[PDB]
Nucleic acid binder design. Sequence first.
RNA 1: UUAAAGUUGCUGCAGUUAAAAAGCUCGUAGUUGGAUCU
RNA 2: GCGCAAGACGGACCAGAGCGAAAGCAUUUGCCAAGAAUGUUUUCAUUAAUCAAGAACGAAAGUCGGAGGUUCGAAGACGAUCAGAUACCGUCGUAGUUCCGACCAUAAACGAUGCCGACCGGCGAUGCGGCGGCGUUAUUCCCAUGACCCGCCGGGCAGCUUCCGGGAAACCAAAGUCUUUGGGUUCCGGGGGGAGUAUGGUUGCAAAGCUGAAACUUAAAGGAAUUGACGGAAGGGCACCACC
Lengths: 206, 132, 101, 82, 24, 129, 82
Amino acid sequence: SGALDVLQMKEEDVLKFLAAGTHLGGTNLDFQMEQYIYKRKSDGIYIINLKRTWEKLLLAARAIVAIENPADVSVISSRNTGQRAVLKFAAATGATPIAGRFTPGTFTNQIQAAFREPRLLVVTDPRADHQPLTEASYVNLPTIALCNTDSPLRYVDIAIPCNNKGAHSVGLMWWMLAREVLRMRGTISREHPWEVMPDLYFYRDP
Amino acid sequence: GRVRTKTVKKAARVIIEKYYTRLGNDFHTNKRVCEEIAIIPSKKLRNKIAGYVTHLMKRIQRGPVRGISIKLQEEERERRDNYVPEVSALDQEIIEVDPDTKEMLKLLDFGSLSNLQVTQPTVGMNFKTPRG
Amino acid sequence: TKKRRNNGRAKKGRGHVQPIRCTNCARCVPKDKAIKKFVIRNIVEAAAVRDISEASVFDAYVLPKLYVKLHYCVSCAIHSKVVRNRSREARKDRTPPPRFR
Amino acid sequence: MQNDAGEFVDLYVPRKCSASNRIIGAKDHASIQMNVAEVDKVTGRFNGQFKTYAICGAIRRMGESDDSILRLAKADGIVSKN
Amino acid sequence: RAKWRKKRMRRLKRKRRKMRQRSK
Amino acid sequence: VRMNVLADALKSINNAEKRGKRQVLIRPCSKVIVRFLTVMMKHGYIGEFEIIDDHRAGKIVVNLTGRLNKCGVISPRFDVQLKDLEKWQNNLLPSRQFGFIVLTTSAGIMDHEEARRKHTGGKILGFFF
Amino acid sequence: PLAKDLLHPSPEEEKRKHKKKRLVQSPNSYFMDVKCPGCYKITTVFSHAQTVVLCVGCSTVLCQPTGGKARLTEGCSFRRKQ
RNA sequence: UUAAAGUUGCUGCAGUUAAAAAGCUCGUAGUUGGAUCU
RNA sequence: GCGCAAGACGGACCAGAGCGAAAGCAUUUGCCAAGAAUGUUUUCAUUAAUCAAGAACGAAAGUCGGAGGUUCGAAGACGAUCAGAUACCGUCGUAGUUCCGACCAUAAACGAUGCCGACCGGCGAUGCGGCGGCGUUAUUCCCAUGACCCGCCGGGCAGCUUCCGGGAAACCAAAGUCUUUGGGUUCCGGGGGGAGUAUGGUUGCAAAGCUGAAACUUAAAGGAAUUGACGGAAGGGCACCACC
Ligand SMILES: [Zn+2]
């Protein structure tokens, strides 16, 4: 948001962030994630600044929108909590999903079966999706990641400060990114709320 | 020991992922659908594939397996995935908020929120594990 | 070539550490280098408890224990299988063995 | 890069990092070039234009490519003040 | 072992002190 | 102890620019340091800087533009005659198209080309390229 | 980091540093103005006084030296000067 | 005998494991020495 | 079992904890002088860093005289084992081990890594001093004061992690900031042996310490890491041509 009044975050969105526990971090703090937090509260939990979260989410949406081919963006989630939200993000915007185990050599080995050459990479967890994110340093790939307070920022170019551990938070954070991507492209109106609710992105314990 | 081999297991997985509609739970029918389609040598190799097929179809009823992919199962799992309750989990009448989060929302010009309820924080600053 | 960063000891920031005698050899070992074990055992084993309580004149008597601190040299801890050898990387694991499970 | 006659005698002109002003070599496979889209002031849709930033592998191995891009986007007005 | 050879070379010198003197 | 404060000034600037930093703090300040920094700046290597007063030997904050490969001091301050400058610049500078040797002469602190223009020798302070 | 403003540190940054290591040196001590509960004279006392300070004529002890700031006796109040 | 020898190293070598930092500290000569004045 | 005495020794608490220039330092209490770190809007005002000469201390063993001699124990005397044992095992046991006063000046005296100063990534702990902050506890209260809890600052012993950079590598936040080569200064090395030997000088009661060659001989000796082979090194598996 370039200080624009149409791109500012609204109360219906802050209420969604509060209900999902996105503003709440862990007990540890990475030294390169320090500028994204507000304060540490007693019981030793760091609070993430939702204004900063919104700015980083909009920057990531801009970076995604700049890619001409929708399928050139690849979205990856290793943990099951993000596996329903990356197959649902890819079905709305057209990106390429990888849910489950990432095969080493996907981006570097040019004779394998599932060989691909993305132009942009979006991952759910820098610590869990470390192999796809370091393999991207061999083939000139930009990286967008959902980062907690203890997340390292190596090979991470756009880090979104959020609670990337809770299922509701992960689903909401993936649902907001798709919403902003569609509303930036111009396929969804910016006045009417999205008829798709965040529940479609959430993870359910069987 | 009676352990199958990669040849029979691969052939059976391919048969199941390609012909899910005709295969079933009965061994003696799956034994006759394999001979109609797959060009297999003698009966002993034909049966060991059609037996593991029957064994491996029961597991599908229990749920999906990490070795095959049926598009009908894809459709069923998409019907499962397209599930949303009438009342979402994120619309709540009251949201409990710490006194420290309330000040952050104040800095975010969100001091007029009416669903909030500031709660009492924990007093004892004991959030570490004992060492040793 | 050097094997251990701590030289097989615990000595840091001091010059001399008083020696002790190995329980098995009576060999002089520096106290920070010796292999130490605290043993809290029962005086009577499980093969004798049933024959001890039936002869005890006190109801609900609790049988005593035995507390011994044992010091080994590097040679006896290896011969008696108190300490094993392990791979180059495993050598850097200094967590006590999972006996408390 | 040019002789006394003014002719350009350089085979090609390499890129430079937007963060550290370092030359990005031909075998720097950990360097990225990223486009960030630009929107309309009123409707807020993709204008059709973008701004480009180049980051070098040494800087993004160091962990400082997240703050570098944020600083460069703040400088260009894309990111709000604080 | 060099310790023993050092010991051996010292006994030789101690004996050569006696067998090689100023009075000789 | 701290001898040759200019050596510490030039080693701090070199070490920070290896890390890709945008500002460096130099303590203590000195007028030799300031003149050397001005000589570096007028050639486009560092940029604007600023002196902080402490009622003591002050300090300096220097902005870095990523254009510096090396800046170093020579100890001791050898005397250089105008006929021995070519050997020094062969030994110290990476090419005949760029790089500078900084000397102190009776006409001021300058680089090896202004000294040639003014026809004067001096004592070698250091170099930068 | 990597673009930390060394010229303008925030007041919370500088108050946390060692006194000698700040951008400009500053003491952590002060002169505090103490009032005896019985006497009426008002006495200036150093925060880190090493001597037992007492009233000239009212014959009352004002403070006792410790390893840090001097400890005021009970019933004595104070307020920092300017 | 010179270069090769950056294997005598001022330019310009080495001293944890290959050759090698005195057991440790004091201390005279020697060597070196913080801002600051148009 | 109850007493008496003699000399030696300070267990368990005791730690990758503390102190000291290093050797080194552990029962209570008292006296004597000393010391670091922290605190400081005190004082002097360059008074400093490293050091030929020259000096102080320096484990253990060893040498001279006095005292005492529990235990252990070179030498020695035996009993075993063994093909042989002048050894390893066992029984005794001299000097010594202890104290007082003089010599001796050596150790894998090691972090195998001189000292002083600047810059260069994170994280959690720990010892000391100081500063701040909810709340527990010294029983119900006044404040300080102690024991916990959460942080910050300085000086210490260390630990984990890292594509900081180095290196032959092992590895090292120093062993980094080195062909992009200069902060100050002391000592010391130049293929392997002969050889730390001979000789001269010097110190010492002695044993020995310090300084210290050459003739001659030799094409390698050596350091890291890698595949095997082997181990009277540790863990697993299989076989009626293995056992049960
Ligand atoms: Zn033993």
